[PDB]
Amino acid sequence: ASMDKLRVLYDEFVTISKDNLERETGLSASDVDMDFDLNIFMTLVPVLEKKVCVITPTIEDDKIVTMMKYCSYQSFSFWFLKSGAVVKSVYNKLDDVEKEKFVATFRDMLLNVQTLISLNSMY
Ligand SMILES: [Zn+2]
Ligand SMILES: [Zn+2]
Numbered sequence: 001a002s003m004d005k006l007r008v009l010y011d012e013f014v015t016i017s018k019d020n021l022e023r024e025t026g027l028s029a030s031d032v033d034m035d036f037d038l039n040i041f042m043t044l045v046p047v048l049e050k051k052v053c054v055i056t057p058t059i060e061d062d063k064i065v066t067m068m069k070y071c072s073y074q075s076f077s078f079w080f081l082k083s084g085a086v087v088k089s090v091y092n093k094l095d096d097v098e099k100e101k102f103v104a105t106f107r108d109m110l111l112n113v114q115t116l117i118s119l120n121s122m123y
Contacts, residue, residue, distance in 0.1 A: 001115035009109045010034055014078050016102060020090040021073060025083050033077035040075045041113045048110070055110050064107045065091060 018029040048067045049055060068087035073079035087106065094102055 001112045006038070006109070006112040006116075007034070009105055009112060010038065012105045013109055016094075016098075016105070017073065017076075017087075017090055018078055020093060021079055021083070021085060024089070024093065025085070027082050029078045030080055030082075031077065037076045037078075038113060041109065042117055044071060045110060045114050045117060055107070055114055057107075057111060059107060061103050064103050064110075067110070068106060 014029075014032055021027070022029060045055065048070060051070055052067050053059065053063050065088060068091050071087040073085045073087065073089075074081050074083060079085070091099060091102055
């Protein structure tokens, strides 16, 4: 986990999300606001942990895919209020190989974010 790694992870998340949301829905993505969206993920992590399980590097793929059902794209800068699609809607239309990468990207983003709600509670 690192600030520079998180930027690359977030940009991967947006690139895949954007390409799939655009062709699925016919609507065009908006400009990113990375800090706004990482704020959204910061608020989401505790909800995901209560509704599904604690996020650790060994969390099973099925628990991550279920967390994607509780992540609404309308919450983020690049899809802001455009449709009610959730992250699993993009997952469901990837091929098997692309699916594995998306799960890893979404899990590693949640771990990098969580590594920061952590730093923000240290005195
Ligand atoms: Zn394209
Ligand atoms: Zn901002």
